[PDB]
Amino acid sequence: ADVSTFLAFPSPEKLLRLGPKSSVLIAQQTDTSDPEKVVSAFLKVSSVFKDEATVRMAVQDAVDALMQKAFNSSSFNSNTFLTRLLVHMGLLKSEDKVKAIANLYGPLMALNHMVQQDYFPKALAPLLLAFVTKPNSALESSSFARHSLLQTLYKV
Amino acid sequence: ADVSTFLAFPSPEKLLRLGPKSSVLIAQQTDTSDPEKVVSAFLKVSSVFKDEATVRMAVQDAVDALMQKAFNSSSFNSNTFLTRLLVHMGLLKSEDKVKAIANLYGPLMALNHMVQQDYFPKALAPLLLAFVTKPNSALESSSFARHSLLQTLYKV
Amino acid sequence: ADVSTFLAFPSPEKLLRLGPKSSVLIAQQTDTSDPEKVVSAFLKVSSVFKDEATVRMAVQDAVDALMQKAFNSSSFNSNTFLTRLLVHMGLLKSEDKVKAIANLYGPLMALNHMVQQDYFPKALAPLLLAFVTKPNSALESSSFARHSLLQTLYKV
Amino acid sequence: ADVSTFLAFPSPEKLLRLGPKSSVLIAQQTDTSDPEKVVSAFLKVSSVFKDEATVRMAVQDAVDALMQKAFNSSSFNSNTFLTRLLVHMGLLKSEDKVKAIANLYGPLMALNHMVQQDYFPKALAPLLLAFVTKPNSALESSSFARHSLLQTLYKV
Amino acid sequence: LKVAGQDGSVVQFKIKRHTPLSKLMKAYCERQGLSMRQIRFRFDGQPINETDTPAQLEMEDEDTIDVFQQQTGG
Amino acid sequence: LKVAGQDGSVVQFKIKRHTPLSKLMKAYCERQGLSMRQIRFRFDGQPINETDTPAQLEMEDEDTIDVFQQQTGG
Amino acid sequence: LKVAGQDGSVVQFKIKRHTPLSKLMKAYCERQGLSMRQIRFRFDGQPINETDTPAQLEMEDEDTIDVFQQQTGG
Amino acid sequence: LKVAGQDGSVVQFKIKRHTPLSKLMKAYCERQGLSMRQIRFRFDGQPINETDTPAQLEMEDEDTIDVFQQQTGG
Amino acid sequence: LELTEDMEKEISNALGHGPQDEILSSAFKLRITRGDIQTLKNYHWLNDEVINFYMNLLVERNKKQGYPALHVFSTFFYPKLKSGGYQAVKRWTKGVNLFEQEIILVPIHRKVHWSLVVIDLRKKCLKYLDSMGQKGHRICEILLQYLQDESKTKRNSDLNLLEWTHHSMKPHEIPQQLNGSDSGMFTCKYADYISRDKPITFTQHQMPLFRKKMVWEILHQQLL
Amino acid sequence: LELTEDMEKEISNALGHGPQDEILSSAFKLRITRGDIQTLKNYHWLNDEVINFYMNLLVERNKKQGYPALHVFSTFFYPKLKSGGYQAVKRWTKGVNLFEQEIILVPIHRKVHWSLVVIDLRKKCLKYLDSMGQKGHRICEILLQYLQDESKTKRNSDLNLLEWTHHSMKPHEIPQQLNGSDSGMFTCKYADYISRDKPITFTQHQMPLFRKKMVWEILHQQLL
Amino acid sequence: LELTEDMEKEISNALGHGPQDEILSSAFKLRITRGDIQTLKNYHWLNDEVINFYMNLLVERNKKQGYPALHVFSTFFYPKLKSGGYQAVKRWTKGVNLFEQEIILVPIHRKVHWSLVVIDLRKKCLKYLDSMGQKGHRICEILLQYLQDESKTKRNSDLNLLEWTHHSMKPHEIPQQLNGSDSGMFTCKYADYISRDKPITFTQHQMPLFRKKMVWEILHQQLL
Amino acid sequence: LELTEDMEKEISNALGHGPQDEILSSAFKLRITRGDIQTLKNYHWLNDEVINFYMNLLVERNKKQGYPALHVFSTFFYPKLKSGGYQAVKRWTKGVNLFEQEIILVPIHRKVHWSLVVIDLRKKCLKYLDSMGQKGHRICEILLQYLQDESKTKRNSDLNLLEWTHHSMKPHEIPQQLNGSDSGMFTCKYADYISRDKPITFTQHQMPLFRKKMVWEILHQQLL
């Protein structure tokens, strides 16, 4: 039906173009007997959120519906879930974080050295700095997601 | 000679096993007429740093030497350099950081919702939290490198 | 009137208990000829935001109204504004950030030393770690505000 | 003696101007029967660290000495210690971090709104951004200390 | 009567006897910006209330009240 | 006909001649999870469309299409 | 003589006339933990020095000095 | 003999029979930048060693070795 | 001990949604709203109402359950005294002669933290208890001067201070916290076991529950 | 140059609110939606439609404005070739004999980055241009092998490669970026000045505007 | 079980200071250095030597302690197969006929993660075990095709696949990890209990110790 | 203006390596060490010596270069006055009658910030100048009370305050900073142009250089 269409290419409009039955129509057309379908569907549904009242609350009720359904499902592994979410959201795995920090330790002590040396063109002092300033270098991605989450875990 | 060996498989010992001529012997066996060799070599040399006095200062003098050499080299593109460093160090590029934050905006408003809902097993409240706590999820890599750098750009 | 009351002790209900004239009733009872009143009032109004549709959009329209009013006011110093906001929001000033980092540099190299020494009770290894984990030590405040802001400055 | 002088106004030179007996001379002139003296002294000693070989290792041996002394002292409360360190180092306490995040939640949703509105002078778009960029607003202090610490708790 | 602050302020007055001081405070909230959820009044210690009256709590001429910024800790 | 992926996949078929492949793709989107905004089809290079037809773009028996994960850079 | 702090302290004394107060301060530094790079003395305002003498700067019996925590801003 | 990479490389050769390939690898490390702690050689699967010899591990003309980037996970 | 599953949904209700200035208790001239009360949540930092209240429920429980003369001071007392001398603290307590009591509690609030100074008139000695590790010597010495000069100028009777003693409270005795949020409880829970001459024997593990309970005992004002 | 204040509100409109899958152009069998197009915003990383389109508007402008035989390759071409040899690239171009042209562009996409390899048939040489600093040698050597073996097995005519040359593109010549987001433009803007044998003379300062303009030239398909 | 306090200081010694390329074991043509071995530390992500070794100590313990024909594949096997078909995997195993064995382990490494596919020849079925939650269907289906076409072109004997079965491994059975670092153990520990037809019964709490032990069993090569 | 390349290496030398308590100037009973002086670096927050000095070099330059009676107050003056009334500020200035001067500067330090209150005796009015945006009304009203009650109890002459005026300093006039570190200069640079009745006309762009210069003028004490 419209629900299967919607899924394929989610969209605020595709979502609102289902009236109030959308919420319950998706949690029902979704097999909560193996968290991979619930994750992939919990994601498809929220990949639509936009600040706007309509699309916002649309999404909420649509998810409170898919979550109950699966929280009363025995075959539902709540654990494998949270766990499969955090990965396809980069909050878990994504990179050998330790090893990385490990490869920086040295290069970061040398580069942090050069800069302070006399034999360093006064030119780059402001190039380098105004360089780890562009968003692709300053904007921190999941370490932000992670915090927004904690914020709520402690609730407020 | 020993220098070419060292390079291949750098190592604190390989480095100290060169007496005081190591410093100048590498900046000289290194063609500073195309920053890719200087980066790859500035990296190989510092991939040896260990807190220890010997290996530490060994590395410093070894780099102050490779940097002068190339800073008096016309064919040396100081710009392409800094720029090729920051990449193979993940401080620049590494990921479409914006797009990423873009894909989190929604999933992070929903998951941040579920958690606060009554229909959420009081079980995970502490599972989830004590989950974005393991180092592979808390330990932030290059957003640390980046800061240690700035620290010095403002010098102290 | 109700508006002056509301101000004193803002509140989602006090805010909604004004019908649709609230928005325009506050931007009007507010003298935008010296940003300190606009800041203090832009703050009082948003110190009410709660995720909920009502109180949310109530706040938005209430602010889009106070902002226009002052953006068409000559005596309005848009600069002194942003600037007086960021302070009473800790994103600017709050602490001699450099000097601070300066006082940590050393203590952080020593404490980072002790920990790695043999003469360090294997006891604290997990005490210390599971100690800079409590929210009052992990939850980062304005360095979060700051990022959420940037996120939008680059819009999405 | 020189040790009591040194303490008052610590200093790399005051420290090195004690030969090799400095290390052991301080852990001994320091009563490790109430952690407040050990903290205040562990701090005075490391408030001297400077990257330089001399002053660096001087400080290390000076601390490995004060730590053993107190780790073999019964009256020594290792707990009250770590705990009194983290405070006078801002990694613990310093601010009602939750409450703070609490007061930002709203103002940060409004200001994050205004910016995106049409009625917002295209002027500030780059003023605001290039404003939470000055180090006194970008340079994060103890949330850096905290990370450098963790780095080691997981050792490398 | 007077309203001595914490900062090192000292703003003085007078008012109606059996009068509801509910209005002696909402006013001075605006008169300082200080929102009440952030500050608290205390006369000789005993927190004053809306419904109380300068008359009742028996304060006299040149009587000083006190205002404190709300405190928290942990 | 077949739909050789990038991974090192190789899933094969057949379908109606002048038939609208608009449905040969929404299906295989579900059949892989792959949402189309993330992937793109390309036959011998020329991006196929909804309204095109295996018949039209003249592909024959044992003809392989290709699917790529959307790319970006900067 | 006395050494009134900022906190709301009030520690009192006496000492030698033409005596070098260089030692009246290193002592009270330890006697409070306060390192001198963080605090500064000021008698009636004029920063006292090592080489000065209670006698010289002419202070008398019951004369109060002042100590302030170092300040910074930007 | 040849040294087929992972990328989609294919660099070919020849060398001495009972010859120590200890030198067939340090060379190609430089010849690619690839440091050995990051990559590993494997002939038909069996990791080759320094001390082994193309002769010994019995490889013949047109025999392909393989190089992989070091992997890790958790 | 106790956990009335129903008394529980009387908690999640006061640490819940709706008004932030919504009253939920009243007494000793204090109004604990859904704002104040919420500081009692997990990891949340407690305020001065939440504390200035549970500090008054203490007086009531000592008087109706046969315990020592319990006189409590406002959390705003010490500060005003560390700055405005006794003179600006004088009339504070005119509705009461102090030495007439046995025990006196004083909520020491050092910005961002909470400690407690226990004055035991019976024993003629004071104690500064700090959940973290701090020692308070200068903190006690102020209070006593308040007292020697308290009675001296309210009964012309000085106070042989040679008779008086005070002191710090070594951390190896009294339980310490293992974080930096739960100090507001250690600052009250001390004030209880101390108010019933009961050995301070509790740990962090319990606190979270002391958390819920406290909103209850503080709501009903039914101090258990 | 130009800035039609009205043509401007035709931009903020396509980098605006509403549908993310809302089409706003069509051509060479590509549909640039309000999603793709948005990658052209400031600091935003460009996609493969936005590029695979402005790379086709190039062919049209060379043919109708009297410029060299402009044949462009899909951004998905090199990758498939770095892995699936020529054999799995064979039929790709059957609707065309290549050497019949003069210039050939190839969008080199190395995950998270964009470079360009310019094949000049006229000159019998290729060039790898990289906004950042990278050098591409292995990147060119693949392409040529594609070509020697391209014609050899499509015209039985080999290719004396001794006649062929290629090489890197030193950064001191062609402008480099000063960030890590604007590589998608340097990767196209090269592909233009190079397509009109016009000296690559531009800088970062201009780009932001090249940004707006590109959505315009890409919307109307009216390549200026 | 065991903890020889002395065998302990043989561990802190190999996860210690000094050379990073310093050898500390050797076997099946592999040299575990103070670099590789260190991936076995707490929270540290394990490499392909550490795993390709404990995966060979398994074969030895099955053969000398009377267990099933244990044939193990290189961690680099599946990848090369997911890309280079069987043809570029052909000669890999010529020094062995497979079906001649009973059990076959295969270390599935999906960049940043580790899973395991267990082929039980006895039972004619394969199993994909994943510490996290993932399901591997496409992962198994590749392997089998490797096998039907493995024997078919090495013994002219096909493989009635109708006789064959495989399947995922529901997470409610086999223990899952509670972090994102310790997957390298779950990926081996499975490979053991599975290699002794022993019920996979273990938890995260144990792992940290499995960590130390593994360096030991891996050092001495004395598999316990 | 000026930049003696040699006078420059007299700067990088005092903002350099070595002692942190190493003196580099002396005057009006103040010793600017390599610690204090370093607060004048870029983005670095200035202290109270660095300011209490350049605030005294001002008095000297007005007296030897023919400028108004310049009396400056300690940065610790206002604070002590906002708390300890005049009585604990009384004797401060006995070595001087004030109204005898023309202009009086007062470094207003509100923790983490710096502002300036300019008292113009000639004009009988005060001005609070703030680099950021703040308005100071309560800040001025304190000072005046200091003064009405200053002379009243040091010359039995009150002060018709009806004759007196003060006021804020609108930000659209005096230049404001564009960060949060450089307030210590705006707080002095005001104190100069104001001390020579010279129109405050300067911007952020200049400051960084005002930075270097200030260490110079402050080192030599040679105020330019």
UniProtKB/Swiss-Prot annotation, chains A, B, C, D:
Belongs to the RNA1 family. It comes from the Eukaryota. This is Ran GTPase-activating protein 1. The modification Phosphoserine is found at S4, S11. GO terms for molecular function: cadherin binding; GTPase activator activity; RNA binding; small GTPase binding; ubiquitin protein ligase binding. The keyword Heme does not apply. The keyword Ubl conjugation applies. The modification N6-acetyllysine is found at K93. It is found in: Cytoplasm; Nucleus, Nucleoplasm; Nucleus envelope; Chromosome, Centromere, Kinetochore. GO terms for cellular component: aggresome; axon cytoplasm; cytoplasm; cytoplasmic periphery of the nuclear pore complex; cytosol; dendrite; intracellular membrane-bounded organelle; kinetochore. The modification Phosphothreonine is found at T5.
From Swiss-Prot, chains E, F, G, H:
GO terms for molecular function: protein tag activity; RNA binding; SUMO transferase activity; ubiquitin protein ligase binding; ubiquitin-like protein ligase binding. Its main location: nucleus. There is a cross-link at G74 (Glycyl lysine isopeptide (Gly-Lys) (interchain with K-? in acceptor proteins)). GO terms for cellular component: GABA-ergic synapse; glutamatergic synapse; hippocampal mossy fiber to CA3 synapse; nucleoplasm; nucleus; PML body; postsynaptic cytosol; presynaptic cytosol. It comes from the Eukaryota. The keyword Nucleus applies. Belongs to the ubiquitin family. SUMO subfamily. This is Small ubiquitin-related modifier 2. Keywords: Acetylation, Host-virus interaction, Isopeptide bond, Nucleus, Ubl conjugation, Ubl conjugation pathway. There is a cross-link at K2 (Glycyl lysine isopeptide (Lys-Gly) (interchain with G-Cter in SUMO2)). The chain holds residues 20 to 93 of 95 of the full protein. Polymeric SUMO2 chains undergo 'Lys-6'-, 'Lys-11'-, 'Lys-48'- and 'Lys-63'-linked polyubiquitination by RNF4. Ubiquitin-like protein that can be covalently attached to proteins as a monomer or as a lysine-linked polymer. Covalent attachment via an isopeptide bond to its substrates requires prior activation by the E1 complex SAE1-SAE2 and linkage to the E2 enzyme UBE2I, and can be promoted by an E3 ligase such as PIAS1-4, RANBP2, CBX4 or ZNF451. This post-translational modification on lysine residues of proteins plays a crucial role in a number of cellular processes such as nuclear transport, DNA replication and repair, mitosis and signal transduction. Residues 1-74 form the Ubiquitin-like domain. Coiled coil: none annotated. It is found in: Nucleus; Nucleus, PML body.
From Swiss-Prot, chains I, J, K, L:
It is found in: Nucleus, Nuclear pore complex; Nucleus membrane; Cytoplasm. The active site is at H113, D130, S183. Residues 31-195 are annotated as: Protease. Polyubiquitinated; which leads to proteasomal degradation. The N-terminus is necessary and sufficient for nuclear envelope targeting. Protease that catalyzes two essential functions in the SUMO pathway. The first is the hydrolysis of an alpha-linked peptide bond at the C-terminal end of the small ubiquitin-like modifier (SUMO) propeptides, SUMO1, SUMO2 and SUMO3 leading to the mature form of the proteins. The second is the deconjugation of SUMO1, SUMO2 and SUMO3 from targeted proteins, by cleaving an epsilon-linked peptide bond between the C-terminal glycine of the mature SUMO and the lysine epsilon-amino group of the target protein. May down-regulate CTNNB1 levels and thereby modulate the Wnt pathway. Binds to SUMO2 and SUMO3. Interacts with the C-terminal domain of NUP153 via its N-terminus. Interacts with MTA1. Belongs to the peptidase C48 family. This is Sentrin-specific protease 2. The chain holds residues 366 to 589 of 589 of the full protein.
